Scaffold this active site. Structure first.
Site, short mmCIF file in Angstrom:
data_model
loop_
_atom_site.label_atom_id
_atom_site.label_comp_id
_atom_site.label_asym_id
_atom_site.label_seq_id
_atom_site.Cartn_x
_atom_site.Cartn_y
_atom_site.Cartn_z
N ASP A 42 -4.28 11.39 8.24
CA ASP A 42 -3.21 10.70 8.76
C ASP A 42 -2.38 11.12 10.28
O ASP A 42 -2.38 12.40 10.53
CB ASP A 42 -1.99 10.76 7.69
CG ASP A 42 -2.25 9.95 6.59
OD1 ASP A 42 -2.37 8.68 6.83
OD2 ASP A 42 -2.27 10.49 5.54
N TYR A 67 -10.63 -3.25 4.34
CA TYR A 67 -9.61 -2.54 5.26
C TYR A 67 -10.31 -2.44 6.40
O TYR A 67 -10.92 -1.53 6.67
CB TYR A 67 -9.11 -1.33 4.69
CG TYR A 67 -7.67 -0.40 5.45
CD1 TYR A 67 -8.01 -0.22 6.77
CD2 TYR A 67 -6.70 -0.43 4.72
CE1 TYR A 67 -6.76 0.32 7.51
CE2 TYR A 67 -5.53 0.23 5.28
CZ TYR A 67 -5.54 0.35 6.74
OH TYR A 67 -4.42 0.90 7.20
N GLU A 85 1.07 -1.23 -0.03
CA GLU A 85 0.09 0.01 -0.09
C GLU A 85 0.94 1.40 0.22
O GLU A 85 1.97 1.32 0.73
CB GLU A 85 -0.74 -0.12 1.44
CG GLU A 85 -1.45 1.12 1.23
CD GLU A 85 -2.76 0.97 2.35
OE1 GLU A 85 -2.27 1.06 3.52
OE2 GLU A 85 -3.89 0.68 2.10
#
Ligand SMILES: Cc1ncc(COP(=O)(O)O)c(CN[C@@H](CO)C(=O)O)c1O
Ligand SMILES: Cc1ncc(COP(=O)(O)O)c(CN[C@@H](CO)C(=O)O)c1O
Ligand code: NA
Ligand code: NA
Lengths: 253, 394, 394, 253
Positions: free
Chosen positions: D60, D175, D49
């Site tokens: 993030d 995910y 990834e």
């Protein structure tokens, strides 16, 4: 009071005007101030008007303001100013001595007590610069009880009502600040003799004030500028004072 | 003579040189006339409402009084245009100047708030404004000086005497004496020669008039006490005037106690000075034993007038109002407390009034009491000052 | 799905990571519920009126329009508690947080005004508030940072990315993603993911609602145009919302043109950027050709949001509102003009709106027009900035 | 898409889990990034990834944020990231390569154009971190037209409605961010195989995720910390990467 009556009666017999210089007591220090005053009298001053330094002279221009600051730099207080007046009187018994006071310094320890202290040291008159005729009754009464002349300013914006009160309440002299007319009305209301004040800084204005009918002239700040200019030489200061005063006095003759 | 009484008992009066008498008499006649003129009243009301932002809120402070039986409202003069109550009477006095046909304004200021009020009123109403301020105060009020000047006012520093408010006060009177024909002297507090203690009261009394209306609406009865700081006395006489005839309502004025009355470094002449004659009035003053006038000390720059309005001296003398003092550290503590519990940052002048209300509450926490503090100004202007102290102590 | 439409035409939406969806949905349900709850509405109204100082004045500026046929009113959001309109929606959003049972608030701020609003609302309402702000902006907003902290708020500088507003914006979303269960994210403008563009409008719309009431009272008809600055879009959507269905009334938003649109150094994405997806919405943004998001430049710190609320993008797209830009020097000129002719010192953000009204008047001085400018904040905070420039040029 | 189907079918025949490391393209510069990636594949990475640097990665944590800043210090742009992906694919034809993108970089030059560019360079999947399932239709459709798997995150605060949409809309892998239950429902709704994400930074968590029923694990930031710690020695960085990846991969067996 008496010393004014005696003086003006004497000047009238010589057909002369009074010349009255103003200085701040203690400027630029006590000893030099005693000497400036002696010099103004030796030179011909007919009467004196003497400033007591006060923190907030809301009725004085810059020249006088600076005179106060010099006096305060020297540590002068009203109690020292009164020792100085006693000394000055023990030297010169007849010259009328006027004080230019702010009301707080008169009111501070009691108004009658201030005028009793004036009387004891030999002052003849007091002009309180921030008490108008409207507020003056306790000042004038105490002044009168201790044989001190209360002096009032007769402003250029004066009207009839005021001219009558200044004539009735004032004694010693009227501080004059239609020149010829004001004078005539003051005479008509039997006011204390008029001294022209303000602006008076050359001989020809002295002659002019006498011509107009005033009894004389007072020089409100010109002496003070001479001091300010000569601080570096006390001997040159005395010399120019004497010179200036003899010339103004000469003009009144 | 005069149309109105110039004395409050023995205090007040018109102790000015003879040459300024006619200026005062003129101002008093204009004022008495204005007060009966519906048109003048309507124009004043219109500017207060639509320009200045009246009426101001009366805000109830519930978090600060938690766990006590005190309910505290704060009268929000900090939300008026300009951030203080000074704006009210400048508008009234500027309108009077116009009424007398004058086209210039002369003002004095210490912390700079009344200077900014006078420069804003004069910008709005088309008057040419010059402002006197002690050099020492110019030096520490640069933001205020620059606002005055952005608003078109001429700022004149005064270096004579102590170079502080009283010296600016004398210079302003000096100037007016020679210019009153086309200039009005816009005095900034309820002090000075008559008629100013009367005019300023009457142009600040909407404070108390609104507070009465708003406290009756929200609590259905009058306050137990109204509390205000006292520097020259205007915000406080404006909060107390409409209550003077309401005998149950206590009036408490708070003077700055500075480092502590015992130190001598304070600004509390009403209770700790001596009557004298200065600034055109007879009233209590900070003065030496020989009668020289001295400065008032406070952590707040706006409580620096070294005397107090005559009407305060009189209401203290006959016991209708009570006057107390609050020190710098108490004021600073009240400033912190309001910020953190109510989200309002008060002027440090008004923080003296709050600190006294906080002491009334904390000293007797089960006494039931309804108190209104006049929050005379906002304290954005004091953040640097508080920052530095807080920094000098950690 | 959602209870309300998240799009204004193609703009808006909920572009956030999946983990923050439930937070948004929760906020929207709380909001829809609050809007129908008379009690919530009454508590909001009470705080606006008694704490914040609503309604604000609508002030007519006669000296500035002299000799033209333009009449200009200024909506005085500068007199609200806190000195800007930001206070309105913080109160509404804090009350919503309470309604959802939350006890902490997360806020982002750029110039610091919304930071101070959120720290005051949270001090008043008992919420624990932490505030994110770009390090570069902390650095130039020390007075604002210290007010936040006096009010009890934790200020967290953000050093990632450009260390400015957008980075504070990301950090705030990061934090909420992990704390929405007990914390509400109090976004400061009408932008970001639905429901925030709707909530902020609805909590600022009293601006326009009051302006309509007050202009009908004083002039008996609606304005020809209402004019407001646009940084993220809240003050302006609050002035325009109650006029959108009044077709004769023009809506003009003004973005900062900085040094000039041609220079590239501006903050005008609605008219000179490109649609992108960031900060949870699809809307015009300052971005590079490859799609990195960039900063908006303006002399005013508060017009720094690098995109614009979606409802503005939509009202421009269908031609109901018109958007223009004003440069730094035009804003500075309008700031000087208001101070000297009306005695009001405006925020430099609001000085962009004034400068455009001044251009409408001066460009066509015999056109008869009734214009209202929203004066979104006071400009006490900008005096140093204006001082320095005026000093760098003489 | 196909490469995922092939990979998981191969891991299921060896009864093994996937181990999928995440790194930022171009961190700390292009050449060193190409080499880190080669090392992660030589060491046993089953899929990759890969982060494209974007100015405002609001999804993030700090480790990744710093990775972006290093990449931008190196001058890396998305067009350079796509040259890198083409090179990486020409070296390793079967390993599925996933991108972790922000929506603005996909939307910028047109969403269908972004997915056409992915398809041309040989990417297998794209997770857009700030597009929830609610907003994903244009992204998923364009992804599908260019045979690219759109990946969705299944958050721990997921409910049934969401699990059904992630199962229907996602491809390639899900995910995953009641672990055992989420997995069972995803299987029940025939979702793409689940990779456990977040937190994965030691071998025992890899074994644990496989035990719970996931198809494998993704290590979202641990590789990135190894880079950050070893910036001063590129050779020590490769060594610890290899070491770390061989151990995590071993755990999946
Ligand atoms: C917020 C505020 N609150 C109170 C006061 C005290 O004045 P007052 O007692 O007349 O109300 C001041 C005065 N400030 C004066 C004196 O320095 C000025 O020239 O600005 C003030 O600024
Ligand atoms: C007086 C004033 N007027 C206008 C604006 C612009 O915001 P808006 O377009 O949302 O109204 C701001 C914003 N200020 C924001 C963004 O920096 C803040 O965090 O303080 C403002 O402070
Ligand atoms: Na005082
Ligand atoms: Na913007």
């Amino acid at each position: 009071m008496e010393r004014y009556e005696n003086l003006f009666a004497q000047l009238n017999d010589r057909r002369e005007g009074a010349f009255v210089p103003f200085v701040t007591l203690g400027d630029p220090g006590i000893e030099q101030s005693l000497k400036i005053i002696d010099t103004l009298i030796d030179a011909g001053a007919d009467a004196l008007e003497l400033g007591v330094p006060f923190s907030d002279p809301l009725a004085d221009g810059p020249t006088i303001q600076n005179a106060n600051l010099r006096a305060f730099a020297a540590g002068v207080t009203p109690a020292q100013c009164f020792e100085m007046l006693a000394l000055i009187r023990e030297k010169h018994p007849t010259i009328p001595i006027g004080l230019l006071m702010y009301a707080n310094l008169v009111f501070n320890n009691g108004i009658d007590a201030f005028y009793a202290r004036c009387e004891q040291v030999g002052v003849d008159s007091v002009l309180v610069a921030d008490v108008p005729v409207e507020e003056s009754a306790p000042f004038r009464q105490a002044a009168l009880r201790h044989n001190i002349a209360p002096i009032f300013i007769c402003p250029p914006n004066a009207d009839d009502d005021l001219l009558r009160q200044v004539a009735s309440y004032g004694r010693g002299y009227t501080y004059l600040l239609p020149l010829h007319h004001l004078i005539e009305k003051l005479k008509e209301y039997h006011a204390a003799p008029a001294l022209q004040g303000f602006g008076i800084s050359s001989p020809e204005q002295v002659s002019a004030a006498v011509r107009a009918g005033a009894a004389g002239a007072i020089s409100g700040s010109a002496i003070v500028k001479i001091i300010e200019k000569n601080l570096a030489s006390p001997k040159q200061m005395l010399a120019e004072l004497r010179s200036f005063v003899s010339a103004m006095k000469a003009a009144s003759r | 003579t005069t149309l109105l009484n110039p004395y409050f008992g023995e205090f007040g009066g018109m102790y000015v040189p003879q040459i300024l008498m006619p200026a005062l008499n003129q101002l008093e006649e204009a004022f008495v006339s204005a007060q009966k003129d519906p048109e003048f009243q309507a124009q004043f009301a219109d500017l207060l409402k639509n320009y200045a932002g009246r009426p101001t809120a009366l805000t109830k402070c519930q978090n600060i009084t938690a766990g006590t039986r005190t309910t505290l409202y704060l009268k929000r003069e900090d939300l008026l245009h300009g951030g203080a109550h000074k704006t009210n009477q400048v508008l009234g006095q500027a309108l009077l100047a116009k009424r007398m046909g004058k086209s210039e304004i002369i003002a004095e200021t210490g912390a700079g708030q009344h200077g900014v009020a006078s420069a804003l009123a004069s910008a709005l109403l088309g008057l040419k404004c010059r402002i006197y301020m002690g050099a020492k105060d110019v030096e520490r009020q640069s933001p205020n000086v620059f606002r005055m000047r952005l608003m078109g006012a001429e700022v004149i520093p005064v270096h004579s005497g102590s170079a502080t408010l009283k010296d600016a006060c004398n210079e302003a009177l000096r100037d007016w004496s020679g210019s009153y024909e086309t200039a009005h002297y816009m005095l900034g507090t309820a002090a000075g020669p008559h008629p100013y203690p009367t005019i300023v009261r009457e142009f600040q009394r909407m404070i108390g008039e609104e507070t009465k209306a708003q406290i009756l609406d929200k609590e259905g009865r009058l306050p137990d006490a109204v509390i205000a700081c006292v520097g020259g006395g205007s915000n406080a006489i404006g909060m107390f005037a409409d209550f003077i005839n309401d005998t149950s309502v206590g009036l408490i004025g708070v003077e700055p106690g500075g480092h502590g009355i015992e130190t001598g470094e304070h600004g509390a002449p009403l209770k700790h000075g001596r009557v004298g004659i200065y600034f055109g009035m007879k009233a209590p003053m900070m003065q030496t034993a020989d009668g020289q006038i001295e400065e008032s000390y406070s952590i707040s720059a706006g409580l620096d007038f070294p005397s107090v309005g005559p009407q305060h001296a009189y209401l203290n003398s006959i016991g209708r109002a009570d006057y107390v003092s609050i020190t710098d550290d108490e004021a600073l503590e009240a400033f912190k407390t309001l910020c953190r519990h109510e989200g309002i940052i008060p002027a440090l002048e008004s923080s003296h009034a709050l600190a006294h209300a906080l002491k009334m509450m904390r000293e007797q926490p089960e006494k039931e009491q309804l108190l209104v503090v006049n929050l005379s100004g906002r304290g954005d202007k004091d953040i640097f000052t508080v920052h530095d102290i807080l920094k000098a102590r950690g």
